[PDB]
């Protein structure tokens, strides 16, 4: 049996270590796969011997006696946000762990959090609230109210301006809905 954490979070530029434990029995190698949502998993590494192996910014560790493996990611990038799958072979059948979804937080150079109201392009006086430019340690308060929907934080990259921004969107099928509340 393969045991991996469900979720992990790290900030861009840091080092992350994703731990995996497996139950010996028939050990013929440990695999690490990268799976972006909702794409095809792709091979990262294979480890049959102990201990640590570099493959660019990623290092794979194996300890056969402990039934332990870790995937180490240095110089963390936004593109590393994916699930990382720990898998065990015994050389035709590979059994996969449930995966660890890694969220990479952007390093916001000059934060200026603000809530803005955006108006519908067509009509019906429909509108959305946008909480943006907050730094990555900021927690987006989920709605306790049945009529208001609040999305998770989203990292946007302009790249041409070398600018990254976090946002969260909120709306209600009810009017008049307050923009200055929900996210606070």
């Amino acid at each position: 049996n393969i045991d991996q954490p469900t979720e992990m979070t790290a900030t861009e530029g840091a080092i992350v270590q994703i731990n995996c434990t497996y139950q010996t029995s028939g050990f013929n190698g440990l695999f690490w796969y990268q799976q972006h949502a909702g794409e095809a998993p792709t091979f990262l590494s294979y480890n049959v011997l102990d201990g640590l192996e570099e493959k660019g910014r990623f290092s794979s560790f194996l300890s056969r006696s402990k039934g332990y493996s870790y995937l180490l990611l240095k110089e963390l990038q936004m593109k590393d946000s994916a699930s990382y799958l720990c898998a065990v072979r015994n050389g035709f059948k590979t059994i996969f762990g449930a995966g660890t979804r890694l969220f990479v937080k952007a390093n916001i150079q000059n934060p200026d959090p603000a809530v803005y109201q955006l108006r519908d392009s067509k009509s019906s006086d429909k509108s959305v609230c946008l909480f943006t430019d907050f730094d990555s340690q900021t927690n987006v308060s989920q709605s306790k109210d049945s009529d208001v929907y609040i999305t998770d934080k989203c990292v946007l990259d302009m790249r041409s301006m070398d600018f990254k921004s976090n946002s969260a969107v909120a709306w209600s099928n009810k009017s008049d809905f307050a923009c200055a509340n929900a996210f606070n």
């Binding site: 909702g38 294979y46 996969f96 803005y116 955006l118 509108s127 921004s165 946002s167 969107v169």
Partner: protein, 243 residues
């Protein structure tokens, strides 16, 4: 060269219906695999094949049929589709000699429902950048909202001046349930497109949010008083404005 290919990409099935999932590989790989994977949630082996004539059971075989007629093809069969079979199906290929890694296909997302009456296309709305954001940041964020769709079989894209854009876009990785306390809740998905204030301030610029909905086919029976929720694109647009 090309890798593992899979057909179809999406499918809505009524309970009891039959379906075949097709997988191909042009890598001359001896081993082929069929996995299912729920949202997130991991990879579970259904069946596998070591070569042409042979087929073998995995972790979760009941009740899927399988065939490896040719070395290049691997087929998965659903005799009488059940709602428990709603999943993403991944095909995989591996050589026998000497090893090692598995090459995966793009996946087939299948949704099996008791009633096709829960099938709804999204409504798409574009929200114009806040004048306060513009004057403050010299940046302009557009928001697109895809609402009321079911099942979660959508692809959202932004099109500027007839060209698809990726820079400055961020789409929710997963959609919200509009009614959380319901197992067949319709979905909501948001996306942000952020440009410079000067780009948005140009009335020659056209901003379009596109949502492709994979729904019903011609073969499927519709007995409701509302437009049949077939596979379609729903779009909302905005033009740039000086103020």
């Amino acid at each position: 060269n090309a890798g593992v290919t899979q057909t179809p990409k999406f499918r809505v099935l009524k309970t009891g219906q039959s379906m075949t999932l097709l997988c191909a590989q042009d890598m001359n790989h001896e081993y082929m695999y069929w996995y299912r994977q729920d949202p997130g949630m991991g990879l579970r082996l259904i069946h596998y094949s070591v070569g042409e004539g042979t087929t073998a059971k995995g972790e979760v075989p009941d009740g899927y049929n399988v065939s490896r007629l040719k070395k290049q093809n691997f087929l998965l069969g659903l005799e009488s589709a059940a709602p428990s079979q709603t999943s993403v199906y991944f095909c995989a290929s591996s050589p026998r000699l000497a090893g090692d890694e598995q090459f995966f296909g793009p996946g087939t997302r299948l949704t099996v429902l008791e009633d096709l009456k829960n099938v709804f296309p999204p409504e798409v709305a574009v929200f114009e950048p806040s004048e306060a954001e513009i004057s403050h940041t010299q940046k302009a964020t557009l928001v697109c909202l895809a609402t009321g769709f079911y099942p979660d079989h959508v692809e959202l894209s932004w099109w500027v001046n007839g060209k698809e854009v990726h820079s400055g876009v961020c789409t929710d990785p997963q959609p919200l349930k509009e009614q959380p306390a319901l197992n067949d809740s319709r979905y909501a998905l948001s996306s942000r497109l952020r440009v410079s204030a000067t780009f948005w301030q140009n009335p020659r610029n056209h901003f379009r949010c596109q949502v492709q909905f994979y729904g019903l086919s011609e073969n499927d029976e519709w007995t409701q008083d509302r437009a049949k929720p077939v596979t379609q694109i729903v779009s909302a647009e905005a033009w740039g404005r000086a103020d």
